Structure 1
Amino acid sequence: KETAAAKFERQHMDSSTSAASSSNYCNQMMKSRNLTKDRCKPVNTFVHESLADVQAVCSQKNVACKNGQTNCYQSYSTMSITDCRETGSSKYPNCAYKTTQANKHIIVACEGNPYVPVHFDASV
């Protein structure tokens, strides 16, 4: 039932200006988006832009994906993001993260009809 497009929304969208949280944004968000349920997802990026602006990237700069597929796209403008990376002390089920806020060009893999973001590949 969860589509690839919905999965990208759950894993990566957080439309707001920038990270807001009552406590460590990554620890709160990784848990709340279910990214610590089955393992500690080790790296994950949230994007603080509108869905439309993220979706439009699928029509922007065609770039190779890290895995060698050719269906990746880089945003022409920088976007507000937050990068979550597991700490050394993190051990599932007590997942723990370092929060890095940034303004970078995103790279997403797009798939489907409609052609929409389904994976977050890199920020540059």
Structure 2
Amino acid sequence: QDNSRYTHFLTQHYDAKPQGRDDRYCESIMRRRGLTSPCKDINTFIHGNKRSIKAICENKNGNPHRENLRISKSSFQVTTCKLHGGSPWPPCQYRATAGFRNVVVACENGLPVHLDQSIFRRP
């Protein structure tokens, strides 16, 4: 799976331009992306252009972080979908939280392949 990890990243965490980042948006995009067989308990999408997210992998927009991660220097429009209900099986009900801040990703070959969801599990 060469560069198939980056594609998967985009599929689970990227949405160039959403419209309303409300609950319905979450239930819709989570379903559409297929993050609904067992319902994912929390998932965050990054908005904006891809060039910017990719740059987090170079010093252009990233800083080393924790063990083996990278934290972006710029902020991103973001939407976090939190599962609601206490059942990992559909229908999957999500609560949306729109936000604006930097993100933490893991890079491989200059490409994002993992988003650290911990900074959004804003408890």
Normalised to the residue count of structure 2, the TM-score between the two structures is: 0.83
Q: In the alignment, what sits opposite 1:7?
A: 8
Distance in 2 between residues matched to 1:62 and 1:49, nearest whole Å? 22
- 2:84 equivalent in structure 1: 87
Give deviations 1:64-108, integer Å, cap 9, x for gaps. 1xxxx41x1111111100001111255412111100000011111
**Is 2:96 the counterpart of 1:99?**
yes
* Structure-2 residue corresponding to 1:74: 71
Cα pair 2:23 2:94 within 8 Å, conserved: no
Q: State the distance in 2 between where 1:79 and 1:89 align.
A: 29
How many residue pairs align between the two structures?
114
Q: Match for residue 49 of structure 2?
A: 50
Correspondence 1:18-37 to 2 at 5 A: 19-20=18-19, 24-37=24-37
- What stretches of structure 2 of length at least 5 have no aligned partner? none
Q: Deviations over 1:50-77 (max 9, x none)?
A: 111000011211101xxxx41x111111
Query: Does the Cα contact within 8 Å between 2:16 and 2:46 map onto a contact in 1?
Result: yes
- Structure 1 distance, partners of 2:87, 2:71, is 31
Q: Output one character per residue of 1:22-52: Cα deviation in whole Å (capped at 9) or x when no partner.
A: 9711100100001002x10111110011111
Task: Specify every segment of 5 or more residues in structure 1 that has no aligned partner in the other structure, as ranges.
Answer: none
Aligned in 2, Cα 1:23/1:78: closer, same or farther, shift over 3 Å?
closer
Q: Do 2:41 and 2:88's aligned partners in 1 also have CA atoms closer than 8 Å?
A: no
Q: Secondary structure at the match of 1:40?
A: coil
1:15 CA drift (Å): 0.8
> Aligned equivalents of 1:23 and 1:61: distance in 2?
32
Amino acid at match of 1:74: I
More helix by share: 2
Secondary structure in 2 aligned to 1:92? Answer: coil
The one of the two structures with greater contact order (alpha-carbon pairs below 8 A, sep at least 6) is 2
